[PDB]
Write a protein that binds this ligand. Structure first.
Ligand SMILES: CC[C@@H](C)OC(=O)N1CCCC[C@H]1CCO
Ligand SMILES: CC[C@@H](C)OC(=O)N1CCCC[C@H]1CCO
Ligand SMILES: CC[C@@H](C)OC(=O)N1CCCC[C@H]1CCO
Ligand SMILES: CC[C@@H](C)OC(=O)N1CCCC[C@H]1CCO
Ligand SMILES: [Mg+2]
Lengths: 125, 125
């Protein structure tokens, strides 16, 4: 099955709360639209360049990047609620090695790969 | 101290059989001893420079490396029998980004991290 899980327990409401100020910072800096984000989260993969840089910005603001700004997958996994540790592991297991010229492209590569792997449990806010 | 699982079903006999010719090539190329391998497999983590190179050689002969000889963890996971996939997921989750000067150092880093993470299921042949 592929239709997104959205209910009282998933995505973890406390993670969603935590991401709010990061969303404000990153949406403001990038100029992506709230709709672009929700369409990527809940509907079809699409290509929006400002959305790619929003994705990058989130990783930086969440402090899950290395000294080159590349996503550190252990840091990221560890930053998630324990309730989604298994789902996250399987979502990411064929998305270890991002490709792309810029950080925005690599950020996008990761989000696209996750959503392809587990569309039901993938979300973006 | 947790006991390595060694019985009729684990490590998977078919994998053990398949790896015999790789063991022969790599021991011949690196000059590691049979005893060094078995002791790393079943007893204490230990430092042996030829053993580190044997470990690198196995990755190479198993064709689970990238163009520069570094371990590609997806190719590796995919090379294992399905019976081992879950075990490998958890064994390797803290072990994504090997450190070390040489390919042999990085191969050793991975084997040590795996054996540290799950000494029950870790083996080396
Ligand atoms: C969005 C999913 C992302 C956080 O992925 C992971 O949970 N990964 C990456 C893939 C290997 C397993 C695990 C690494 C944990 O150390
Ligand atoms: C938790 C830190 C943040 C940078 O990680 C994420 O970008 N995630 C976490 C869940 C996987 C997709 C994505 C959605 C977030 O809106
Ligand atoms: C001996 C373990 C090795 C074969 O596998 C892994 O380290 N994997 C599986 C490949 C995806 C990344 C990682 C899972 C991290 O949680
Ligand atoms: C199957 C390809 C081969 C290069 O993988 C390994 O070297 N493994 C995988 C089994 C756990 C660790 C190690 C021991 C095997 O001698
Ligand atoms: Mg040295």
């Amino acid at each position: 099955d592929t239709t997104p899980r959205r209910d009282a327990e998933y995505p973890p409401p406390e993670l969603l709360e935590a991401l709010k100020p990061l969303h404000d910072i990153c949406l403001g800096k990038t100029g992506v639209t709230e709709e672009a984000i929700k369409k990527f989260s809940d509907e079809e993969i699409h290509e929006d360049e400002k959305l790619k840089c929003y994705m990058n910005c989130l990783f930086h603001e969440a402090k899950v990047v290395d000294d080159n700004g590349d996503v550190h997958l252990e840091k990221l996994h560890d930053s998630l609620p324990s309730s989604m540790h298994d789902i996250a592991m399987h979502m990411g297991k064929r998305c270890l090695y991002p490709e792309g010229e810029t950080l925005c492209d690599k950020a996008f590569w990761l989000h696209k790969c996750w959503k392809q792997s587990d569309p039901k449990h993938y979300f973006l806010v």
